[PDB]
């Protein structure tokens, strides 16, 4: 009995958890990519030139099947997040857009 209202409400709660988590964390001493929410997952502060990881967000309907997965994103050398984001580990195990369109 999954509705749009429930999924959106769970996403909003995840977003709120990310805000509070980032607000409580002390920012680091030196250069680092800023902790941020990218509409999908919460990113902690990351070291420059390091690959950040974030657990698959719990609001996903299929979260139990990807609980041990991680989203990946690179922190640039100058302390700016890269644009690339890999959430393949967090995809629905039954993903297939061609048959969904069918």
């Amino acid at each position, epitope marked *: 009995g999954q509705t*749009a209202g429930e*999924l959106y409400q769970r*996403w909003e709660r995840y977003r709120r958890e990310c805000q509070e988590t980032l607000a409580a964390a002390e920012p680091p001493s030196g250069l680092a990519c800023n902790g941020s929410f*990218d*509409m*999908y997952v919460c990113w902690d502060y990351a070291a420059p030139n390091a690959t950040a990881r974030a657990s698959c967000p719990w609001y996903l309907p299929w979260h139990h099947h990807v609980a041990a997965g991680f989203v990946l994103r690179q922190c640039g050398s100058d302390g700016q997040w890269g644009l690339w984001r890999d959430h393949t580990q967090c995809e*629905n195990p039954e*993903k297939n857009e061609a048959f969904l*369109d069918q």
Partner: antibody, heavy 120, light 108 residues
Framework: QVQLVESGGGVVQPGRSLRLSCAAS????????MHWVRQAPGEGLEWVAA????????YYADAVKGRFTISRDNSKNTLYLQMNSLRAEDTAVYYC?????????????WGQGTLVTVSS | EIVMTQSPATLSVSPGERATLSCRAS??????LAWYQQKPGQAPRLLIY???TRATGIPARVSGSGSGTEFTLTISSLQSEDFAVYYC?????????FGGGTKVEIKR
């Protein structure tokens, strides 16, 4: 800031197909769901379709079930609407709209629309 | 589909007066309801979501209330830009649906 511009509108014969596109700028396209909404001349807003930020799922209005297909190319910052078996009552301005989140629940910023005329 | 019905179809209000618009859902949509404004020749405009939360840039004179099946949009003092068509929309479940619209015209 947010800019959505629709393209591909025009005249199509009844029963034929047409595809609209929407180019996004001023925000990170891959972080948001998207919507299509249409408005017949002199009429109200009618939701058409929506799509996840990563196309995980797609949703359609009853009026277009089995005929329309929404999709997106994040590398080109473009949203698409493939329309098949068009009928005269599909004539409308078609709006591209960004979702407030990543699923397609609330269109929070809208484009200007493109007119689609289904006629012989 | 969840049927959204707005009343009245046309609301006649004097400038500076309060406009009170009604939206009804055919079944409970909790607080998963949004309101939009549209001027002729212009794209729609998000005003309220969550039945009562104003979008960014929306003045305090616009307020939304309600939950379940009955909602209200209120603009306490209409300015020139406030005369337009207003739509409600539920996102409790897909397919998303808009109300038929309520036109707010200048009374004379």
């Amino acid at each position: 800031q947010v800019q959505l511009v629709e393209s591909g509108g025009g005249v199509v014969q009844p029963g034929r197909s047409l595809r609209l596109s929407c180019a996004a700028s001023g925000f990170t396209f891959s972080n948001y769901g998207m919507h299509w909404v249409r408005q017949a001349p002199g009429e109200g807003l009618e939701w058409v379709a929506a799509i996840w930020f990563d196309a995980s799922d797609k949703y359609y209005a009853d009026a277009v079930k089995g005929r329309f297909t929404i999709s997106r190319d994040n590398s080109k910052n473009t949203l698409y609407l493939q329309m098949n078996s068009l009928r005269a009552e599909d004539t409308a301005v078609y709006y591209c709209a960004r979702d407030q989140a990543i699923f397609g629940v609330v269109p929070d910023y809208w484009g200007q629309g493109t007119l689609v005329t289904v006629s012989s | 589909e969840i049927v959204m019905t707005q009343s009245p179809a046309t609301l006649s209000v004097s400038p500076g007066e309060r406009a009170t618009l009604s939206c009804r859902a055919s079944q409970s949509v909790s607080s998963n309801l949004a309101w939009y404004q549209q001027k002729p020749g212009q794209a729609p405009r998000l005003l309220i979501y969550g039945a009562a939360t104003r979008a960014t840039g929306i003045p305090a004179r616009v307020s939304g209330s309600g939950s379940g099946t009955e909602f209200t949009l209120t603009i306490s003092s209409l300015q020139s830009e406030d005369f337009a068509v207003y739509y409600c929309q539920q996102y409790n479940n897909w397919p998303l649906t808009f109300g038929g619209g309520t036109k707010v015209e200048i009374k004379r």
